[PDB]
Amino acid sequence: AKIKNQYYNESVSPIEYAQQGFKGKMRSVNWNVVNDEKDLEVWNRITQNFWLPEKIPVSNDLTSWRTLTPEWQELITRTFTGLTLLDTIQATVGDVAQVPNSLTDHEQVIYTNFAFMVAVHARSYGSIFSTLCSSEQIEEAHEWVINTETLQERAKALIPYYVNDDPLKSKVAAALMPGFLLYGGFYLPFYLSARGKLPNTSDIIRLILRDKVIHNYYSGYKYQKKVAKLSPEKQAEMKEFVFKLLYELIDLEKAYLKELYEDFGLADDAIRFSVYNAGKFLQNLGYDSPFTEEETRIEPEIFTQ
Amino acid sequence: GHMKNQYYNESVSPIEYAQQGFKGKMRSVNWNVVNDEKDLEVWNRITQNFWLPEKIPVSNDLTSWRTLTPEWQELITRTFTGLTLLDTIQATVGDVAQVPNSLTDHEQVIYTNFAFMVAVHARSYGSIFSTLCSSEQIEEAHEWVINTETLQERAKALIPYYVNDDPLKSKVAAALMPGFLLYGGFYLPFYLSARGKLPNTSDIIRLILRDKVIHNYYSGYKYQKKVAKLSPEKQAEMKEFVFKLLYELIDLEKAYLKELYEDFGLADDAIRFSVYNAGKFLQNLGYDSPFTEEETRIEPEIFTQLSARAWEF
Ligand SMILES: [Ca+2]
Ligand SMILES: [Ca+2]
Incomplete structure (x- = not known):
């Protein structure tokens, strides 16, 4: 032939x-x-989307930063340092763990881009801190990160799937991280920028999200490629795994956001923002979202951001 | 008194x-x-040096490419596909393997940049092929790569260190790949561009080298940082390992370059160019080069191409 x-x-x-x-x-x-043309499309988009935090003049946020109380500044530093932990996990453990589970040669190196770009996400929060925060604010947020059990429980939840030997469960974790776990934190800068605060910071958040959306989409695409080859029984086992893990992480996220935002009244709103993205995560793995409109309600000013 | x-x-x-x-x-x-300021310096340099092959107008090489015989075009496609294999190994196995062996948190993510940028290096040869080569030339070269034992033996040589449980030997391998193993192949585009052929391709090679030099430097820096804390016995054992592995790779490289360049007369020159870089590799790990001037001689027109400095990102 x-x-x-x-x-x-x-x-x-x-x-x-x-x-x-x-x-x-x-x-x-x-x-x-290129065995799967989707790999070329994704390589092209992610490399065209290269950025670094120094391109954004965060120093222009100093005027609005200084109108925030010490308590709000502490909330921001803590929230972003918690996001830094999740991005550190994904850059150094999660995305690199996807390399050996790839279906194609091109996918192997796409995940090296994902890992590096997530490292850029983690570096960005620190770039913001260099401009806006005091040494004491930075250090206290790091001490809070290591000592806050609700935060650590989310950080600990996905790591075993990356290290252990089930590639499909590892792939689900690799989609869950960019598709769900950071959105409760991203709610905060968008809430602030809707109110005229920290506009340049929200530009960085939007660059992070532009990458995250593709990471979630692509891991969900590769998940579906493998799962479709399994027996109906094994496909059913995997759907039950996905939903069980998601609901577990939703409960961990709710406990964390309730603690994080307790003094500010933002948790219930941030949780709906989070769960909206949980539905997007499920759809990117080929499943229907069970969540209601009220469970996922995002106010227009936030959705604009 | 006092408080x-x-x-x-x-x-x-x-x-x-x-x-x-x-x-x-x-x-x-x-x-x-940042625990080690060197990590911040290297992060800043490697990220500021980001590039993609779209930066270079490779189609401007078409006029000179068409003056080359089919045998020269085949040599170029084979040589570059063999380099793509080494970069594929380093992007997907070698640099990734350095992440968990880091001394600092910042080094862990620096090696993710290294892995991705070596993937860009491999991508760049593909961009050259898209512009210059027929589909038949490309497929032939991939077939030749898998079937050429002298090439495979070099590709096989470092992989066990990346997957076995000695972090210092893995680090040596991670410096040897960018510091040594591709230079015998890089000789070819520089030979051509010194003679007015494929000048834009050599601009890609120089962007690749700008990254490789830092990868070798940084892995050698981290090697020295760890080794300096070890016992005299262990330091001497590691020096012996470095020289033993380097000499083994030099022998494999000589056999491969002799086969690769056998119809063209380039092997003896490419070998000296390779061994010159073997000496630089040793210096980046803190050792003296034992190689003579004659063993490392590079003609001025080639040295100019190697040494020349390398749309926004
Ligand atoms: Ca509320
Ligand atoms: Ca000769």
Whole structure:
């Protein structure tokens, strides 16, 4: 039938060579023959979307920052340092753990971009702190992060899936992190910018979100590619896993946001913002969202942000 | 008579949390208190050096490409596909493997940048092929890569260090890849551009090298940082390992370059160019080069291409 690229079936990627006990002829990535065109689309978009926090003049936020009380400034520093922890987990553990579970050679390196870009997300919060926060505010937020059990329980929840040996459960975790877990925190800068506070910070948040949306979409796309090849029984087991894990993380997120926002009255609103994105996460894995309009209500000024 | 950052010592990075059996309070990276200022310097340089192959007008090489015989075009496609293999190894295995062996939280994410940028290096050869090569030339070269044992033996040589449990040997491998193993191949575009052929392709190579130089420097810096704290016995054992592995890779590289360039006469020149960089690799790990001037001689027109300085991102 004159099949093209027969060498591909006669060889292995380098990570497969390592996994199989140092066996097989290794092939180079072939960027001229992309097995799944979606991989090329995603590579192009994520690399075109490269940014660094220094491009945004956060120093122009100083005037509005100084109109916030010490308590609001503390809330922001704590919230963002908690987001930094989740991005640190995804950059150093979660996205790199997806590399060896890839379906294609191109996907392997796409996840190296995801890991690096999430590292940029984590670096960005610190860039904001360098401009706006005192040394004491920064240090107290770090001490609060390590000592706040509701925060740590969310940080601990997904790590075993990345380290253990079930690639589909690891993939679900890899979609859950960008698709759900940081939105309760992203609510805060959008609430503030809707009120004229910290506009340049919200520009950074929007650059972070532009990356996160693609990370969630792409991990959900790869999840569906593998799950569709399973038996109906195993597909049913995996759907039950996804829903059980999501509901577990929703409960952990609710407890955390209630503590984080207790003095400010933002938790119930932030939780609806979070759960709206939980529904988007489910849809990106091929499932219907069970959440009601009232459970997911976002006010127009927030949705504008 | 007469009259900071404690949280850091009470916590662990996420990688350390996993390494300890899921134990400990996890800390966020602190980009406001950087334990080793070298990490901030390197983060700033590598991110400011971000590039993509779209930066270079590779189609302007078409006129000179068409003056090359089919045999030269095949040599170029094969050479670059072999480099793509080494970059694929480093992007997906080698630099990723350095993440959990880091001394600092900032180093953990620096190696994610290294892995991604080496993926860009591999992507860039593909962009060149898209512009210059036929689909048949591209497929031929991939077939040749999988079937050429001298190339495979080099690709195989470093992988066990990345997956085995000696972090210092893995670090040596991570410096040897950018510091040494691709230079015998980079000789070819520089040879061509010194003669007016494929000048834009050599601009891509110089963007790749600007990254590789830092990857080798930084891995050698971290190697020295760890080794300096070890016993005299262990330091001497590691020096012996570095020289033993380097000499083994030099022998594999000589056999490969002799095969790769056998019809063209370039192997003896490319080998000296390679060994010159072997000496630089040793210096970046704190050792003296044992190689002679004759063993490392590079002609001026080639050295100019190697040394020249490398739309916004
Ligand atoms: Ca409220
Ligand atoms: Ca010669």
